[PDB]
Amino acid sequence: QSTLRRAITAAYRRPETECLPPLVEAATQSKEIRDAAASTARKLIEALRGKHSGSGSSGSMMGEQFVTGETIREALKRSKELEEKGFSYSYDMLGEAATTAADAERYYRDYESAIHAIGKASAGRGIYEGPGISIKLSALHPRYSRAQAARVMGELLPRVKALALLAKNYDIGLNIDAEEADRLELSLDLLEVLCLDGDLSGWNGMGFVVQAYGKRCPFVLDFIIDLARRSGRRIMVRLVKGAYWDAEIKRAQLDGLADFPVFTRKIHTDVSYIACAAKLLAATDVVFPQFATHNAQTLAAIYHMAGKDFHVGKYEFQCLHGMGEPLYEEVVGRGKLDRPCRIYAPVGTHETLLAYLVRRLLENGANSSFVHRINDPKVSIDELIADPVEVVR
Amino acid sequence: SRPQSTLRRAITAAYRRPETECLPPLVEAATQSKEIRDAAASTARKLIEALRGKHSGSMMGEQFVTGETIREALKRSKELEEKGFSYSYDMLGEAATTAADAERYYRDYESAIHAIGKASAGRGIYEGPGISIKLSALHPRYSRAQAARVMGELLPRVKALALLAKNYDIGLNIDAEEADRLELSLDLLEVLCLDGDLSGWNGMGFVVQAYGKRCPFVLDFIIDLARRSGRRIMVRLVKGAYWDAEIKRAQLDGLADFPVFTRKIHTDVSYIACAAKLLAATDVVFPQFATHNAQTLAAIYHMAGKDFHVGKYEFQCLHGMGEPLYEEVVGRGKLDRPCRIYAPVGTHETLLAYLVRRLLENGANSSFVHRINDPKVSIDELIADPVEVVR
Numbered sequence: 001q002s003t004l005r006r007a008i009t010a011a012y013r014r015p016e017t018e019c020l021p022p023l024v025e026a027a028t029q030s031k032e033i034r035d036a037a038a039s040t041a042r043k044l045i046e047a048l049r050g051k052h053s054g055s056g057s058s059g060s061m062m063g064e065q066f067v068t069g070e071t072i073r074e075a076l077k078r079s080k081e082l083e084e085k086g087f088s089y090s091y092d093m094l095g096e097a098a099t100t101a102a103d104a105e106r107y108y109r110d111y112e113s114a115i116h117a118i119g120k121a122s123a124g125r126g127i128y129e130g131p132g133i134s135i136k137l138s139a140l141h142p143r144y145s146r147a148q149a150a151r152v153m154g155e156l157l158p159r160v161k162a163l164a165l166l167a168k169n170y171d172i173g174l175n176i177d178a179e180e181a182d183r184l185e186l187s188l189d190l191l192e193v194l195c196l197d198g199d200l201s202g203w204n205g206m207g208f209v210v211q212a213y214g215k216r217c218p219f220v221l222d223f224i225i226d227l228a229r230r231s232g233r234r235i236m237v238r239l240v241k242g243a244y245w246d247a248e249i250k251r252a253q254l255d256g257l258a259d260f261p262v263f264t265r266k267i268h269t270d271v272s273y274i275a276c277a278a279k280l281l282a283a284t285d286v287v288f289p290q291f292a293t294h295n296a297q298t299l300a301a302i303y304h305m306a307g308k309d310f311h312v313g314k315y316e317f318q319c320l321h322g323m324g325e326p327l328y329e330e331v332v333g334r335g336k337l338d339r340p341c342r343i344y345a346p347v348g349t350h351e352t353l354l355a356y357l358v359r360r361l362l363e364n365g366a367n368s369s370f371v372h373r374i375n376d377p378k379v380s381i382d383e384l385i386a387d388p389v390e391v392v393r
Numbered sequence: 394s395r396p397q398s399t400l401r402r403a404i405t406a407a408y409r410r411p412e413t414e415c416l417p418p419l420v421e422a423a424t425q426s427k428e429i430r431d432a433a434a435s436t437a438r439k440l441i442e443a444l445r446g447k448h449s450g451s452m453m454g455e456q457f458v459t460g461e462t463i464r465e466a467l468k469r470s471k472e473l474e475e476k477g478f479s480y481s482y483d484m485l486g487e488a489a490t491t492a493a494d495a496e497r498y499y500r501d502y503e504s505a506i507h508a509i510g511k512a513s514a515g516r517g518i519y520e521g522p523g524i525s526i527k528l529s530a531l532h533p534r535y536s537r538a539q540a541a542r543v544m545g546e547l548l549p550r551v552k553a554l555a556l557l558a559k560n561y562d563i564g565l566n567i568d569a570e571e572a573d574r575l576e577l578s579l580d581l582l583e584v585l586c587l588d589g590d591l592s593g594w595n596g597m598g599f600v601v602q603a604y605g606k607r608c609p610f611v612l613d614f615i616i617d618l619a620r621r622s623g624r625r626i627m628v629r630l631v632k633g634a635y636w637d638a639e640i641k642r643a644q645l646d647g648l649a650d651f652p653v654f655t656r657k658i659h660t661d662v663s664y665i666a667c668a669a670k671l672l673a674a675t676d677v678v679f680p681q682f683a684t685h686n687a688q689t690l691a692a693i694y695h696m697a698g699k700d701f702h703v704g705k706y707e708f709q710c711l712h713g714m715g716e717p718l719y720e721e722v723v724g725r726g727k728l729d730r731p732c733r734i735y736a737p738v739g740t741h742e743t744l745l746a747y748l749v750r751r752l753l754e755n756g757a758n759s760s761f762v763h764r765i766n767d768p769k770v771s772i773d774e775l776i777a778d779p780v781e782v783v784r
């Protein structure tokens with residue numbers, strides 16, 4: 001318990017109207033930055049609309065567009081082409097929400113075998129230039145959402161620590177994906193224990209996702225930035241909007257709550273994301289920000305907010321396999337923006353793919369999504385480059 | 394005793410009966426003769442080889458919607474109607490969260506019935522188009538409010554819609570939704586079938602989900618209701634669209650035994666057993682066999698025997714999924730059996746929930762429509778009778 005932890009708990013269901021003013025202020029950019037971001041965003045979107053990206057490119061319900069390979073060996077082999085273009089990878093062994101001990105055990109073995117393969121393929125490239133892995137805590141505990149948080153974390157900790165130690169041995173990144181809002185606190189407690197565990201000293205590969213659609217986002221970030229500074233671990237922080245919005249709304253509508261744990265207007269999430277990006281960019285000494293987005297306006301805003309100084313390891317962008325390549329082909333490389341992007345790369349069979357595909361459908365099919373609007377003949381470029389702070393009303 | 398005590402008790406007793414206890418009667422009821430199984434395998438093999446042959450061997454789901462408005466969807470239906478297909482239109486929208494949303498869905502259904510009835514032009518309930526409705530669209534708290542309150546506000550609304558459908562002589566089908574609303578929807582069906590204001594019209598329809606343990610006992614109740622009401626009830630037999638959600642709900646409810654089967658081939662056996670029940674009651678119900686599975690279709694086609702006329706039974710499929718299969722079914726040179734296309738009408742504001750269920754259907758490794766495109770799955774496996782796996 002701390003003042004920083006108290007701010008997280010206090011924001012859980014803070015009224016949406018009260019959350020917004022501080023985010024609006026922090027997300028407000030100077031005129032020069034806004035003008036430069038508009039120019040960059042226009043250039044990117046014109047390039048995108050000469051392509052055929054977005055929801056129209058999502059492929060068939062077989063989900064072939066979204067999976068990098070069936071096995072880690074297959075996915076690693078297929079990664080060489082984009083790696084020399086300036087992309088990196090974070091591999092996701094598909095599988096989540098284990099319901100039996102056998103399933104949780106299988107997912108653990110999958111993650112463990114992937115770390116060995118990824119770590120050997122990394123070949124000493126380290127946590128920024130080389131590949132990493134992403135895990136879901138719900139894969140590793142058979143009653144992750146339906147058991148007491150204290151006991152869940154206590155059985156989960158040895159498994160996650162063992163995986164982190166393997167990642168340290170090979171010096172690769174290991175990211176904890178963010179899932180449902182009611183599990184933020186548990187996963188954050190796990191992150192704290194790991195960052196204070198002396199067995200993991202000298203390794204900066206521990207990573208953690210924070211969801212900007214959540215009202216707690218800036219306060220989670222303050223806690224993580226402070227944890228990094230005091231632990232000496234340069235935590236990799238993946239800033240995302242969030243993948244479970246429809247489910248969070250449905251659960252909140254059934255819990256009879258007046259105030260949800262997530263925002264309810266998409267523009268509020270966009271303001272939240274930019275405000276939280278400003279917080280992360282002011283903390284690159286102690287954290288490694290990873291800006292996961294397919295929205296060219298969001299990207300261009302962050303690109304200019306970061307300033308002129310850049311080196312590999314300062315920050316990166318990220319995208320999902322099968323969704324982000326058209327945009328980021330206009331970003332990576334010395335002929336573009338010369339900023340790196342890490343591809344989140346699902347690995348598994350068609351069975352383990354289904355739950356992930358449903359979230360990709362809700363993301364690609366929503367009229368509010370950038371990837372849908374980029375292909376919408378009714379949506380102008382002027383609208384696509386609008387600054388969320390200047391639009392909110 | 395209470396009216397229909399024996400039939401109603403059998404439904405309640407099956408609700409969460411252990412899966413192993415549900416299956417043996419269904420397996421025996423779904424067992425067909427070797428001669429029928431050989432003929433069905435030949436038919437299924439032909440259907441599958443045609444499926445690929447005419448189709449060279451989309452997640453955003455524009456192919457799942459027939460039109461943005463009922464006028465648009467009706468215009469786009471002429472081509473397939475001329476071939477021998479019929480339609481059931483679905484105004485997209487469900488799970489109304491406010492009384493105003495429910496009123497808006499009601500008005501969409503009312504206007505659609507006028508338009509569909511005009512287009513029907515007296516073709517009747519079998520050859521002409523119909524409508525499908527979801528009760529969750531018509532009550533603002535459908536999954537949550539007590540059945541007494543839901544019934545008292547829902548019944549006048551559904552009765553008014555049924556009266557318009559009667560006035561145009563079109564079909565009106567109540568779609569089946571989550572398992573916890575089966576009982577309410579069935580009580581509503583009974584009151585409507587016994588309502589004299591709807592006399593003379595056989596267009597009332599009702600879905601039963603074969604993935605549910607109550608399915609054969611619900612069918613018993615419906616067939617008996619048809620006999621005592623004098624209505625020939627249209628009965629759409631489906632497997633079911635909410636399986637993933639039912640499993641998650643039952644886990645969250647703490648249940649030791651779920652209201653649905655957990656082995657996919659058990660749902661297939663249930664479907665075939667229930668088809669045998671419906672095919673023996675065509676005097677009092679109109680069976681509508683909704684499936685995209687060529688093996689299920691072939692089994693029912695041969696189970697039904699050589700005697701057929703339009704109005705005896707039909708098949709059904711979803712727009713954007715079933716047309717390739719049923720183009721090998723409708724028509725004198727094919728199987729000479731009719732098919733009604735379930736045709737969603739709406740926009741993105743109402744497409745999400747339906748599209749998610751389509752993705753869970755199309756993307757599941759256990760689904761026929763996925764297995765037909767899976768290089769690991771032989772034609773032998775696609776045509777195999779699942780009843781022989783558990784017999």
Ligand SMILES: Cc1cc2nc3c(=O)[nH]c(=O)nc-3n(C[C@H](O)[C@H](O)[C@H](O)COP(=O)(O)OP(=O)(O)OC[C@H]3O[C@@H](n4cnc5c(N)ncnc54)[C@H](O)[C@@H]3O)c2cc1C
Nearest residue numbers: 177178240241242243264265266269292293294295369370
């Ligand atoms: C590499 C990568 C990793 C990711 N990891 C995770 C993870 O671990 N956990 C996680 O939850 N998400 C994660 N995501 C985010 C998620 O999968 C989506 O890709 C992301 O939210 C889409 O944002 P965008 O900026 O690309 O698009 P945009 O179109 O700009 O934003 C869409 C997002 O806005 C939000 N939204 C939509 N409607 C509303 C509304 N009415 N009110 C409020 N918010 C709304 C949702 O978050 C939606 O995804 C990750 C994304 C990437 C690219």
Ligand SMILES: Cc1cc2nc3c(=O)[nH]c(=O)nc-3n(C[C@H](O)[C@H](O)[C@H](O)COP(=O)(O)OP(=O)(O)OC[C@H]3O[C@@H](n4cnc5c(N)ncnc54)[C@H](O)[C@@H]3O)c2cc1C
Nearest residue numbers: 568569631632633634655656657660683684685686760761
């Ligand atoms: C015209 C039409 C109308 C329909 N109306 C409705 C309706 O009102 N309500 C409704 O709920 N459904 C309805 N459905 C059914 C649903 O939408 C699917 O289309 C149907 O269940 C798929 O069955 P299939 O025989 O085509 O495919 P198959 O691949 O043979 O069967 C797949 C089905 O098996 C079941 N299943 C999958 N995995 C398991 C498992 N592990 N254990 C048990 N069962 C499993 C599910 O029902 C799944 O849909 C309708 C279908 C059609 C064609």
Ligand SMILES: C=CCSCC(=O)O
Nearest residue numbers: 177178243320356359
């Ligand atoms: C794509 C994001 C990574 S975590 C949530 C999901 O898997 O959708």
Ligand SMILES: C=CCSCC(=O)O
Nearest residue numbers: 568569634711747750
């Ligand atoms: C497609 C079937 C009719 S009812 C369940 C759904 O809408 O998916």
